[PDB]
Design a protein around this ligand. Structure first.
Ligand SMILES: Nc1ncnc2c1ncn2[C@@H]1O[C@H](COP(=O)(O)OP(=O)(O)OP(=O)(O)O)[C@@H](O)[C@H]1O
Ligand SMILES: Nc1ncnc2c1ncn2[C@@H]1O[C@H](COP(=O)(O)OP(=O)(O)OP(=O)(O)O)[C@@H](O)[C@H]1O
Ligand SMILES: N[C@@H](CCCCNC(=O)OCc1ccc([N+](=O)[O-])cc1)C(=O)O
Ligand SMILES: N[C@@H](CCCCNC(=O)OCc1ccc([N+](=O)[O-])cc1)C(=O)O
Ligand SMILES: [K+]
Ligand SMILES: [K+]
Ligand SMILES: [K+]
Ligand SMILES: [K+]
Ligand SMILES: [K+]
Ligand SMILES: [K+]
Ligand SMILES: [Mg+2]
Ligand SMILES: [Mg+2]
Ligand SMILES: [Mg+2]
Ligand SMILES: [Mg+2]
Ligand SMILES: [Mg+2]
Ligand SMILES: [Mg+2]
Lengths: 265, 265
């Protein structure tokens, strides 16, 4: 009873990291699927009976409490943004072809940074130093690596402007944040076209975040005239680590999985 | 000292419903703006010091707890959906020109209903009767009435399938929900092209929700074969009522207002 690719694919959809079953044992496909179908139905029934909270929603609310309690202002900015923002962020016409365009002059935001830069500039006229804000929400990029990449994902970006915007403080916040989530990490240098040199938060070979210590030459284009620090995290990658997901689609907005459990049962 | 339209507009941006000032008193524009600028700066500084939670985020989390505690499963489905969903929902090629199209075959969802219909169908194969789910998230419609309409708004849709899907139960949930938020309402009949007859939840002349008691002929197109009930609410309209906002843009995702306070200070 060798399994076809279509049969292995269907078993992999039903398989969860907590399972310890071999698909290549010689057991017939009919009894592997039935066993997996039964476990996943029990998993969902237990979710429906005792938790009912969505993984991505629950993680957003946990992160929201963490940063609100540490003095950061909670932001909810537009997801549909001017196409003008893209070229102003230094995305030359690369990442520019990853943009989902809407009508003629607008697009789906590929990051939170530009909306947050605007808020920092505006809030600095009213609030005392330092200015601390954060946002969690959908971002959109056309991608070509279906394993750690989604086209529709969830970003956290926290940032600070004014005093205390040092590398050591930025690392300290990242450390407190990931220690709160129970995720081990290392920091390695990297570079992107938008911000220059970055501090990349790595969990093994998985990039959890890119963080930046300003100032950078891009600040003038956005009216930023003070020291600042910031970091962007992918929530679906955080869930992938936390739940040992093989595929990041297990954690994404989807009609095909609920909290890592297949919905095709 | 008569005020120009541009001056009245700027004062209205700075004015909050709790204020009791006349713009047409004869006081010079310079001292009306300064007084309003000072009050709004104090409002934001107080927010930054003692709350820091975003109105739309906080309302989503309050509603989420309400429905999770009442046995509803929390859904987070794609915001970018197939264009195919639109014609299948009965939106003939009206509301069809309100759709924000993305690339060739996709669009920004104008409602949560189609994703939730799919989840009801799938979950019914695994979970016991009745199936109770809900989602809160962005929806998108091109609009032409800048007072109670936004192009980017936030929808709550809760729905149930199986037993207990009666008009009286649907009204009972709506009543418990709005009584929890402290909003008075009345129910009046209406009709839309997608679902047929609707029960519209009205706060005065403001439509807070359209609710539907199935079955409807559209069910077959989506594989729904059981009684069901559902209702969609606009969160920005709920905030407009709760905070006595003159304009619904005070409550929207925006870089121009934080929790109803102008950010151009
Ligand atoms: N397509 C995507 N799907 C899921 N998460 C993403 C995606 N793109 C970025 N992220 C997350 O957003 C964070 C900040 O965005 P950033 O621009 O640094 O991504 P990136 O450097 O392009 O990531 P990668 O090199 O993995 O493509 C990343 O560290 C990652 O966790
Ligand atoms: N453009 C919008 N901006 C803000 N909220 C909206 C918008 N469109 C719909 N809603 C909210 O979503 C709920 C359910 O959507 P529905 O399709 O019933 O809206 P609608 O009947 O088109 O509303 P209206 O008649 O006010 O345009 C509405 O009751 C309303 O509260
Ligand atoms: N996904 C991104 C996440 C980087 C976050 C850094 N930005 C930030 O935290 O917001 C404040 C801010 C934004 C923009 C500007 N600007 O443009 O001058 C100044 C200040 C990445 O790959 O690094
Ligand atoms: N903004 C909308 C909100 C209506 C909600 C009703 N729908 C629902 O609650 O989701 C379950 C569901 C969805 C679709 C179908 N279907 O298409 O057959 C069957 C069942 C309006 O103006 O009424
Ligand atoms: K058998
Ligand atoms: K694994
Ligand atoms: K998605
Ligand atoms: K004066
Ligand atoms: K008012
Ligand atoms: K908006
Ligand atoms: Mg990338
Ligand atoms: Mg990278
Ligand atoms: Mg990066
Ligand atoms: Mg309408
Ligand atoms: Mg209506
Ligand atoms: Mg309606």
């Amino acid at each position: 009873p060798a399994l076809t690719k279509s049969q292995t694919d269907r078993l992999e959809v039903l398989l969860n990291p907590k399972d310890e079953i071999s698909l290549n044992s010689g057991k017939p496909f009919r009894e592997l699927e039935s066993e997996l179908l039964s476990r996943r139905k029990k998993d969902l029934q237990q979710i429906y009976a005792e938790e009912r909270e969505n993984y991505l929603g629950k993680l957003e609310r946990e992160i929201t409490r963490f940063f609100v309690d540490r003095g950061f202002l909670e932001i909810k900015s537009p997801i549909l943004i001017p196409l003008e923002y893209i070229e102003r962020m230094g995305i030359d016409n690369e990442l520019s072809k990853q943009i989902f365009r809407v009508d003629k002059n607008f697009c789906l935001r590929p990051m939170l940074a530009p909306n947050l830069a605007n808020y920092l500039r505006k809030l600095d006229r009213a609030l005392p130093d330092p200015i601390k804000i954060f946002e969690i929400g959908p971002c959109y990029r056309k991608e070509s690596d279906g394993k750690e990449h989604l086209e529709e994902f969830t970003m956290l970006n926290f940032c600070q402007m004014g005093s205390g915007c040092t590398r050591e403080n930025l690392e300290s916040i990242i450390t407190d944040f990931l220690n709160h989530l129970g995720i081990d990490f290392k920091i390695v240098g990297d570079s992107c076209m938008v911000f220059g040199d970055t501090l990349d938060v790595m969990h093994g070979d998985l990039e959890l975040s890119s963080a930046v210590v300003g100032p950078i030459p891009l600040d003038r284009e956005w009216g930023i005239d003070k020291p600042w620090i910031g970091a962007g995290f992918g929530l679906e990658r955080l869930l992938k680590v936390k739940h040992d997901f093989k595929n990041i689609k297990r954690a994404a907005r989807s009609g095909s999985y609920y909290n890592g459990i297949s919905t095709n049962l």
